[PDB]
Every structure is written in structure tokens, then in C-alpha cells.
Design a protein around this nucleic acid. Structure first.
Ligand code: MG
Ligand code: MG
Ligand code: MG
Ligand code: MG
Ligand code: MG
Ligand code: MG
Ligand code: MG
Ligand code: MG
Ligand code: MG
Ligand code: MG
Ligand code: MG
Ligand code: MG
Ligand code: MG
Ligand code: MG
Ligand code: MG
Ligand code: MG
Ligand code: MG
Ligand code: MG
Ligand code: MG
Ligand code: MG
Ligand code: MG
Ligand code: MG
Ligand code: MG
Ligand code: MG
Ligand code: MG
Ligand code: MG
Ligand code: MG
Ligand code: MG
Ligand code: MG
Ligand code: MG
Ligand code: MG
Ligand code: MG
Ligand code: MG
Ligand code: MG
Ligand code: MG
Ligand code: MG
Ligand code: MG
Ligand code: MG
Ligand code: MG
Ligand code: MG
Ligand code: MG
Ligand code: MG
Ligand code: MG
Ligand code: MG
Ligand code: MG
Ligand code: MG
Ligand code: MG
Ligand code: MG
Lengths: 110, 103, 150, 142, 56, 117, 27, 48
RNA sequence: CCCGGCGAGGGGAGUGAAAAAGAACCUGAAACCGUGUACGUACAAGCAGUGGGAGCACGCUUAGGCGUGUGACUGCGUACC
RNA sequence: UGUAACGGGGCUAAACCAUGCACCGAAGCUGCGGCAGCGACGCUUAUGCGUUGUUGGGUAGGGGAGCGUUCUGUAAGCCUGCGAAGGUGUGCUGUGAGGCAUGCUGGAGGUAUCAGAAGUGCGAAUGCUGACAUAAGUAACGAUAAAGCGGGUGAAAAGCCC
């Protein structure tokens, strides 16, 4: 029984988050929580809070034992890019991009 | 047993019971053709070579189907000279099935 | 186009393309290149060509039996119920009705029916003689049409 | 029908031993490259290696005509800027004699992965002996 | 000092081929509190190699 | 009237982009590159319908030359034998016999030698 | 912001550029 | 004889040139004007 | 109701014809970025295709063999305006 | 810059001269099939029907014939909630522009035929507008006056408070 959790509009780049998301693909969730616990990136805080939400949704809404759960699908999509103006020298302006993400964690027994 | 015959300007090695795609003939879809001008008949170290064609040999075939081949696209293009053409083509054919090689 | 006739940037030095006007028909919210004017699409038709056409299609309606001639075509009271009854009795649905007089009860009883149109003999037109399936002419309207058209 | 093509799995290859004593270099090498290519077989196919394994021995006793023993020059370049090098025929025979046959055949073979695969079947030996008796090689006179 | 052709996403992936993170191999387990920690680091509760090295 | 041309230009681009499947990179994604690549592919196809007929004839000839030298005669002697023996067998069929039926190819060789002697 | 973009275009070209940076008259 | 049965005479309506709509039309990029003249210019041409 | 910071955001439940109509809301193309599967790829040189073509995977099938995807190797081949 | 003045390998002929027979070799010629143009001729034209020859590289450019789009009439008609347009696939079809059918999405309009009118077809214009890439998770994070610790609050403290 698959259970989904999403953190849409994650204020972080998808490239920066996919580094973390690739560590826990296919892993048991107790191992993934220990990896994300002792990973020092901010994206580990994000994707851990998402994995915790997917676990609690699978347990509450679907009746699932936590020890059998396993991260079957995980993927990070590009979100909306809020855009800012940063001034440079000689009156020249640069529009910086402030990337977002859509974190998705699918957890199941399979 | 096989045999060699001319049809459609080209030649065909063929045994019995085979289906051979030929160039288009003016024959209906169920009738029987006979290729008398046969060039070679081999029957397991019982060959005979037609000097200009085998005299007594004939190939009896049944017209299976007519049809058009696969579409091909003809593209002409002269670069930097403001010229191109397109042309499709499908070539008529005729599948026959060999009823028998009369040696 | 509402705007200003000022160059959006100078001619050279900048890396952008040359531009002279923001009203340019290659810009967004620019002008139309060949913007239209109110024009009259009316064509001249010669008089003898107009009558040749009417004599042609009235001959064709005869050959196609799409022309019905009666002596009189009146409705007593201006009621569309009476007109629809009369046309049902004539077995007619899509019809043009030409009358050599001005019948007001007939105009009023035919005003609501879209299948039916009622004209004076002067006010006949070729496109209506074609667009209607049947044409009913009063014999007086025939005499006037033949007189007008020689 | 369609024209037959050889298949690298169903193809059979044979082993041949050639003695290169006294034979002319290029006239040997073009028959070797013919049989490594497989142009002596009816199942020749350009994109398929159909040739035979060939052992060449007595490579140091190969013969050239004319003054080519002292005048044929083998140039190469090391990559470095002065790195043009040079060796004659009899220097290559004394120093490393297998290269002479290998170079001539490599020049007569096709250029590409398949031609390098054809070259892998050429096995030259300066002496009169080889460790490939296990492959039951037949003799061949060229 | 700038490119003349746009580099492809294939080259982008090959450059990012080495940018992968190394997960921590195995977490050491305290012998007293039984909780997990980094090897040679103190626990979250303040144990290290059994003893309570700092209250909290 | 103002004909809006989005539908037509979309279907016109997708006809090309469908033909460009399998191509590397923007050649399968981008109309400007793909159209430029589809045209070249039609040019190559027009060319190689002519070159197919060359390359197979070359293959057939090399197989006949091998099998004839296996029977102890060259190609140029063998075609001349079959011309003088009037044998009008084309060299597709000769390559097919040279592969599958070597006895009949031997019989053809002996017919050609008897036509030369 | 394309209005803050108005600034961008309106005056990252009105910055005007300084000029060529090689005292060379190819004369 | 209806409005969807009429058709004009043959040779009455001729299509008319439409310059600058592709190679196949014939009237391609230049539209019957050649290259780089005064005549090819918009409004170009000399007086009577 | 639940995870979460009395968050954001999300999973449920519920409304509704429809929530892949949930307010960043009709339809939602392309560029662009991803996850998954098949095939290929770490001795191999160039407009990246085309002609041939092995093998692999997948469907149909009277096995007949056709399709489909990939494409080892190989001939030719220096974009458009 | 590197053999570098046979294309290379290599050749004492695999060089040259002479003679001869073979063969390879082009989109040339021939064969088979198919399309179209222009002329003959005959028919008896539906003004085109056989046969017949011959032609078919092509820029500027001239001429001829068409596809498709939006809108008007035909149309108070026809199709359509038993699912329109549009989007995405597949299959078929035509010499081509293109056409048809259908699966999924979508959830309300579309329109034959024959005519008519055009804001009628885009890859380029250092084209215009919007969106997304690239370089690249790179440079940089703005004076080299300088920070360290304890406690607190807090989901969390190098930066807040004491
Ligand atoms: Mg300033
Ligand atoms: Mg002024
Ligand atoms: Mg505006
Ligand atoms: Mg405007
Ligand atoms: Mg008047
Ligand atoms: Mg080559
Ligand atoms: Mg460049
Ligand atoms: Mg990196
Ligand atoms: Mg409109
Ligand atoms: Mg794509
Ligand atoms: Mg010009
Ligand atoms: Mg000029
Ligand atoms: Mg001029
Ligand atoms: Mg002007
Ligand atoms: Mg909420
Ligand atoms: Mg949006
Ligand atoms: Mg709606
Ligand atoms: Mg939407
Ligand atoms: Mg998309
Ligand atoms: Mg491999
Ligand atoms: Mg390899
Ligand atoms: Mg490379
Ligand atoms: Mg193929
Ligand atoms: Mg030198
Ligand atoms: Mg000679
Ligand atoms: Mg010949
Ligand atoms: Mg040829
Ligand atoms: Mg020709
Ligand atoms: Mg012909
Ligand atoms: Mg010609
Ligand atoms: Mg022409
Ligand atoms: Mg022209
Ligand atoms: Mg549907
Ligand atoms: Mg519409
Ligand atoms: Mg559609
Ligand atoms: Mg649809
Ligand atoms: Mg309409
Ligand atoms: Mg326009
Ligand atoms: Mg465009
Ligand atoms: Mg252009
Ligand atoms: Mg542009
Ligand atoms: Mg980057
Ligand atoms: Mg760099
Ligand atoms: Mg650096
Ligand atoms: Mg730095
Ligand atoms: Mg600072
Ligand atoms: Mg502190
Ligand atoms: Mg500080």
C-alpha cells in the first residue's frame, strides 16, 4: 500500500535536494532516517520531515506497520522560481532566480 | 529443389511453396502464371543449367495478391539556392506463390 | 497607435537591434502593417445583366416546377394561424409569396414565419428567388414582372 | 529474398601456420591480409570478421628486394615536438623484427575496430616455434 | 573567457558524476544507553563509551 | 478576419518532430535543428537508394571471386566463360549459389571452363 | 519584475557602456 | 438551382499572386523583384 | 483526524457530476527538468545521419514470421540562411 | 610543428614501352513497373478516349494547377453530453501541400458541399513579447575594527537577550 507525502514549494534547489534524495532510494525507513539524521545538509531536514509525514500517513490512514515500510519512489520536481533583481556595477542589473522544489516521497511495504 | 527464373527484369531463386514478391503483372488475383523461361534447376546434385534458358523447364505459380509497397519520401534540396522538392512513391507489386517446379 | 515618436534606444553602440518607433508593426502592441479602412464592397451590375439573370432563374424555376401561379392569395385577418393553415392546405413550407398589391394582413401574418417571405413584385431579388424552395406568384404579379422585364 | 550475411556466432575460423623465411614482405602480407579479412571465403561480409587465425614464424628471415634492407625507413613520432624517430629495416630486424610484418599487415588492413580485430588474429614469431600447438593449426604455403 | 557552444545535458551529467554524496557507513551504538551515534562522537543524551560525560 | 495560426504551426512542427525520432539531442526536440536534419536524411536516402545497388553488386562479386578461386578460376575468367556459354545468371544468384549450393557453383565453373577451352 | 525590468533595459543600456578598451586606432 | 450549386465560368476567376509565401509558390523571398536594386526597394522605381 | 514549529505544506475524510475543477483553481501544447523500464555504451576519433546489419527485449502468430524499440560493426557522408 | 614530392601500405614490378583478350566501373545506356507534359495520328470526343513517338537538372524570373486556415451564404439544415472544438497517440491514405478513422484527455460547441472575402501559412529580420535553459551549484556574500565563553528564550541559536 503506497503512501505519499509532499512538500511542495520547498525553498531550495532541486539539484541540491536530489543529492540527498538519492541516498535513501530503496532503503528501509529506519536506515533512511539515520542517514538523514547524520547528513548535514538542509535538504536532509526537508526530506526527513517529508518521510516522517509519509510514515505517519501510512500508519494512520492506511494501517501499516512501520518496520515493513520501504522507500519505493522518491523524486524531486522543479517548482516555481520567484525572481529578484540584484544590482551590479555600472548600473547593470541581474535577475537572480530563487528556485523552489516539490519534494515527493512514496513509501510502501513492497 | 530450387529454380531460377526471370520476371520483372530481374531474377528469382525460388523453391516450391514459397511466396515471391514480383514486379506488377497484368494478372488477376487468383489465376495461374507459368514462367517458361527458366534458367537453372537444381534438385540435389541433379542440376541443369539453361544455356539461354532451360528448354523443358517451367515454373507454375498462383497469383496471391497485388499491392503497393511502402511509401518512400523523395527529398531534393539544393543548399543556399532556394530550391526543394518533395515526392512520395509507392511501387506496385504482385505476390505469387509457387504451385510447382515442372522440370 | 497611441504612443510617442521617440527611439526606444539609440541607433548604435548598444547590442540590440535597430529601432525607430514603439508603434512598429513588429512590436507587441504595435501598429497593424496594412490597417484597414471602412470600404464599400458594392459592385456594379449592368441592367441588362440583372434582367438576364432574373429571366434565367425564373425560367429555371419553371423547368424545376418551383413556381406556382395563383389568381389570388389572401388571408382574411392578419393571423399567422390562418396563413399557416392556408400554406398547409397548399402543401407549402418554404415559400416566397409575391403579390402585386400591398396586403398588410398578409405582411403581418407572414412576419413571424421564417420559412415564409412576402414581397411586392417590385421588391423581388434573385437570391431570394433561389433561396426559397417554392415561389408563389399572383397572376397580376406575373403581369407586372413580365412588363418590367419586357 | 535478401542477400546472405555472415553472423559472428555461426562463423568458423581456422588456424594456419606460415613460414616467412625468404618470402617477399609485401607479397606475403597481402595474402595474409586477404585471409584475415576473409576474402577467400564465400561468406565474406564487410562488417564481419570471417578471417582465419594466422601464425607467422621466422619473421626475422623475411626478404626484401633491392637496397631496401638498408634504405627502407620506418619513421614514427612520439607526440613530443622533436619526437620524430627513424629506424631502418635491418635495424628493426635486429631490434624488434615482428614489427615489420605487423606494420605491413596493419597498413593493408581496414582502419577501424574491425580491422584492429582482424589484426588481433595475426600472431608473428621470429623463431621457428610457437605455443599454439593446442589449436591444431594446419600449414599454409604463401 | 566564455563558451562558443552550448554544452549539453550529457556533459552536465558527466560533470555531476562525482558530485554524489557518500552516506555514512554504519552508526556506532553506545554500550550503555544503547542509542546510536557517530563513531567517536558523543550521543545526543551525553553518553560516550558508556559514561555520562555531561549532564543536560 | 485575423487568422490565428497556432494550430497549423503546431501540427506542422509535429510532423517534422515525429520524423526526427531517435536523433541525438536537439535534433529530436527542436524544430529548427530537426527540420535541418530531416532534410539531410531525405538527401541521404535518395543517395543511398542508388548506392545500395552498387554495394550489393560489390559484395556479390567478391563472393563469386572467392568461390571461383576456391574452384580454381578467377572472376574475370568465370564471367567470360558464362558469357561464351551464354549463361545469363545474374550475380545475386551466383552469390547465393556460392554460399548455399557449392556443387552447383562447381558445375557452373566447369561449364565456364569448357566454354573457354 | 519586468517593471524592475524596465529599469533593467531602460538604463542597463543607458549606463551607455564605457567604450572600447584597447587604445588602438587601427589607422 | 440553389446557392450551393452555382459555380462561375471557367477562366473567370484567376487566383492572383501572393508574394513571399514559400519556395513552392514560386514567388519566394524576393517576390519577383530580384536582388539588391532600386526596383526591389519599397517604393522604388524611377519616374516616367 | 494525522505528521509538522498552536507552521508552511501534505495525507485522509467530506462537498460536488467531476477536486488529475481546491482558490498558485476551464482546456493545460512546447521548450526545460525529472523518476521508472527495455537496449546500447568504459581500445574508442569528426554535421552525429543514411544504406546494410548481427544481437537483445517485447508483442501478435497457426510455429510460417511479421511488426515495435534499441542499434555492436560497416560503405558513403564537412549544418541552415 | 611531424614521415610529408606514389593517397598509404608496400612494389624490382604492383615501374615504363608495345600489342592483345578479359573484367570492374556512373544517377550514362538497356531491362521491368509507375507518373506527368507536348505533339502526331485515328475516334467521335463528354470535348477527352485508344495507340504512338518524344520529353521531364535547374537560380533570377515568366507561365499553369492546387492544399489548408479564419469569416459570410447555403445552414431555424446537418453532427454533437450515447461526448464538440482543442490536446496527445496509433493505424490507413494521396505525387505534394494534406486527408480520414480511432484510443486517451477534455467537457460544449462544430460544420458538409458549391460559391464568396481575406489581418491566409514563418526558422532566420544583432526581429517584438513571455517563459525556460547554458555557463554553474561556478564567481561572489560590499572596507583586514576582532572576537571568545556561560546562561536564557525557542521547533531550532555563530548572528537575538542577559
Ligand atoms: Mg549607482
Ligand atoms: Mg524630436
Ligand atoms: Mg499594451
Ligand atoms: Mg495594436
Ligand atoms: Mg441604377
Ligand atoms: Mg576508407
Ligand atoms: Mg560560434
Ligand atoms: Mg561537481
Ligand atoms: Mg476570429
Ligand atoms: Mg521529446
Ligand atoms: Mg536580400
Ligand atoms: Mg547586385
Ligand atoms: Mg534589379
Ligand atoms: Mg519606403
Ligand atoms: Mg494546513
Ligand atoms: Mg500556473
Ligand atoms: Mg465550463
Ligand atoms: Mg488547469
Ligand atoms: Mg510537457
Ligand atoms: Mg560492453
Ligand atoms: Mg568495448
Ligand atoms: Mg570524440
Ligand atoms: Mg535497414
Ligand atoms: Mg623534418
Ligand atoms: Mg594496354
Ligand atoms: Mg562488364
Ligand atoms: Mg549503376
Ligand atoms: Mg536516365
Ligand atoms: Mg517504361
Ligand atoms: Mg534529364
Ligand atoms: Mg523542371
Ligand atoms: Mg523562380
Ligand atoms: Mg472520450
Ligand atoms: Mg473555431
Ligand atoms: Mg483532434
Ligand atoms: Mg479529442
Ligand atoms: Mg458557416
Ligand atoms: Mg501575415
Ligand atoms: Mg515561431
Ligand atoms: Mg527563411
Ligand atoms: Mg528570432
Ligand atoms: Mg547552474
Ligand atoms: Mg569554471
Ligand atoms: Mg574556483
Ligand atoms: Mg570564492
Ligand atoms: Mg559584510
Ligand atoms: Mg552563546
Ligand atoms: Mg558576527
Amino acid at each position: 500500500m503506497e503512501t505519499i507525502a509532499k512538500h511542495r514549494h520547498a525553498r531550495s534547489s532541486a539539484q541540491k535536494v536530489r543529492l540527498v534524495a538519492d541516498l535513501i532510494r530503496g532503503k528501509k525507513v529506519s536506515q533512511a532516517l539515520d542517514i538523514l539524521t547524520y547528513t548535514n545538509k538542509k535538504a536532509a531536514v526537508l526530506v526527513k520531515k517529508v518521510l516522517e509525514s509519509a510514515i505517519a500517513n501510512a500508519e494512520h490512514n492506511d494501517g501499516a506497520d512501520i518496520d515493513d515500510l520501504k522507500v519505493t519512489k522518491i523524486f524531486v520536481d522543479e517548482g516555481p522560481s520567484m525572481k529578484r533583481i540584484m544590482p551590479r556595477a555600472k548600473g547593470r542589473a541581474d535577475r537572480i532566480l530563487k528556485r523552489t522544489s516539490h519534494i515527493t516521497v512514496v513509501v510502501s511495504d513492497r | 529443389m530450387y529454380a531460377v527464373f526471370q520476371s520483372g527484369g530481374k531474377q528469382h531463386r525460388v523453391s516450391e511453396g514459397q511466396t515471391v514478391r514480383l514486379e506488377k503483372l497484368d494478372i488477376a488475383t487468383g489465376e495461374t502464371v507459368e514462367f517458361a523461361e527458366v534458367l537453372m534447376i537444381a534438385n540435389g546434385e541433379e542440376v541443369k543449367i539453361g544455356v539461354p534458358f532451360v528448354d523443358g523447364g517451367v515454373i507454375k505459380a498462383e497469383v496471391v495478391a497485388h499491392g503497393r509497397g511502402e511509401k518512400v519520401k523523395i527529398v531534393k534540396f539544393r543548399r543556399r539556392k532556394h530550391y526543394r522538392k518533395q515526392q512520395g512513391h509507392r511501387q506496385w507489386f504482385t505476390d505469387v506463390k509457387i504451385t510447382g517446379i515442372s522440370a | 497607435v497611441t504612443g510617442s515618436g521617440k527611439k526606444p534606444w539609440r541607433q548604435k553602440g548598444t547590442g540590440r537591434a535597430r529601432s525607430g518607433s514603439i508603434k512598429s508593426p513588429i512590436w507587441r502592441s504595435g501598429g497593424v502593417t496594412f490597417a484597414a479602412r471602412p470600404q464599400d464592397h458594392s459592385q456594379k451590375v449592368n441592367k441588362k445583366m440583372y434582367r438576364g439573370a432574373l429571366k434565367s432563374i425564373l425560367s429555371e424555376l419553371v423547368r424545376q416546377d418551383r413556381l406556382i401561379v395563383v389568381e389570388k392569395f389572401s388571408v382574411e385577418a392578419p393571423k399567422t394561424k390562418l396563413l399557416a393553415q392556408k400554406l398547409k392546405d397548399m402543401a407549402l413550407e418554404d415559400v416566397l409569396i409575391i403579390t402585386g398589391e400591398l396586403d398588410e394582413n398578409l405582411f403581418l401574418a407572414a412576419r413571424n414565419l421564417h420559412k415564409v417571405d412576402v414581397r411586392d413584385a417590385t421588391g423581388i431579388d434573385p437570391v431570394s428567388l433561389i433561396a426559397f424552395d417554392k415561389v408563389v406568384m399572383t397572376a397580376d404579379a406575373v403581369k407586372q414582372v413580365e412588363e418590367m422585364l419586357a | 529474398m535478401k542477400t546472405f550475411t555472415a553472423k559472428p556466432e555461426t562463423v568458423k575460423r581456422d588456424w594456419y601456420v606460415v613460414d616467412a623465411t625468404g618470402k617477399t614482405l609485401g607479397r606475403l602480407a597481402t595474402e595474409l591480409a586477404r585471409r584475415l579479412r576473409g576474402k577467400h571465403k564465400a561468406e565474406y561480409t564487410p562488417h564481419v570478421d570471417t578471417g582465419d587465425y594466422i601464425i607467422v614464424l621466422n619473421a626475422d628471415k623475411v626478404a626484401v628486394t633491392g637496397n631496401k634492407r638498408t634504405d627502407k625507413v620506418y619513421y614514427h613520432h612520439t607526440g613530443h615536438i622533436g619526437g620524430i624517430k627513424q629506424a631502418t629495416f635491418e635495424e628493426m630486424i635486429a631490434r624488434r623484427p615482428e614489427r615489420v610484418i605487423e606494420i605491413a599487415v596493419k597498413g593493408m588492413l581496414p582502419k577501424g575496430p574491425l580491422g584492429r580485430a582482424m589484426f588481433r588474429k595475426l600472431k608473428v614469431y621470429a623463431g621457428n616455434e610457437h605455443n599454439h600447438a593446442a589449436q591444431q593449426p594446419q600449414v599454409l604455403d604463401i | 573567457a566564455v563558451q562558443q557552444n552550448k554544452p549539453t545535458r550529457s556533459k552536465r551529467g558527466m560533470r555531476r558524476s562525482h558530485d554524489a554524496l557518500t552516506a555514512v557507513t554504519s552508526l556506532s551504538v553506545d554500550k550503555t544507553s544503547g542509542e546510536k551515534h557517530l563513531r567517536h562522537h558523543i550521543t545526543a543524551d551525553g553518553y560516550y563509551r558508556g559514561r555520562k560525560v555531561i549532564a543536560k | 478576419a485575423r487568422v490565428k495560426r497556432g494550430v497549423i504551426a503546431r501540427a506542422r512542427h509535429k510532423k517534422i518532430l515525429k520524423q526526427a525520432k531517435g536523433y541525438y539531442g536537439a535534433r529530436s526536440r527542436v524544430y529548427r535543428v530537426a527540420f535541418q536534419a530531416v532534410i539531410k536524411a531525405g538527401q541521404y536516402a535518395y543517395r543511398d537508394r542508388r548506392q545500395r545497388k552498387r554495394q550489393f553488386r560489390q559484395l556479390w562479386i567478391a563472393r563469386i571471386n572467392a568461390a571461383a578461386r576456391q574452384n580454381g578460376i578467377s572472376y574475370s575468367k568465370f564471367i567470360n566463360g558464362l558469357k561464351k556459354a551464354s549463361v545469363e545468371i545474374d550475380r545475386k544468384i551466383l552469390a547465393d549459389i556460392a554460399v548455399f549450393d557449392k556443387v552447383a557453383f562447381t558445375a557452373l565453373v566447369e561449364k565456364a571452363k569448357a566454354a573457354l577451352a | 519584475m519586468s517593471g524592475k525590468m524596465t529599469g533593467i533595459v531602460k538604463w542597463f543600456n543607458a549606463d551607455k557602456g564605457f567604450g572600447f578598451i584597447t587604445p588602438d586606432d587601427g589607422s | 438551382m440553389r446557392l450551393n450549386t452555382l459555380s462561375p465560368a471557367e477562366g473567370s476567376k484567376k487566383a492572383g499572386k501572393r508574394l513571399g509565401r514559400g519556395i513552392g509558390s514560386g514567388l519566394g523571398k524576393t517576390g519577383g523583384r530580384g536582388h539588391k536594386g532600386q526596383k526591389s526597394r519599397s517604393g522604388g522605381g524611377v519616374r516616367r
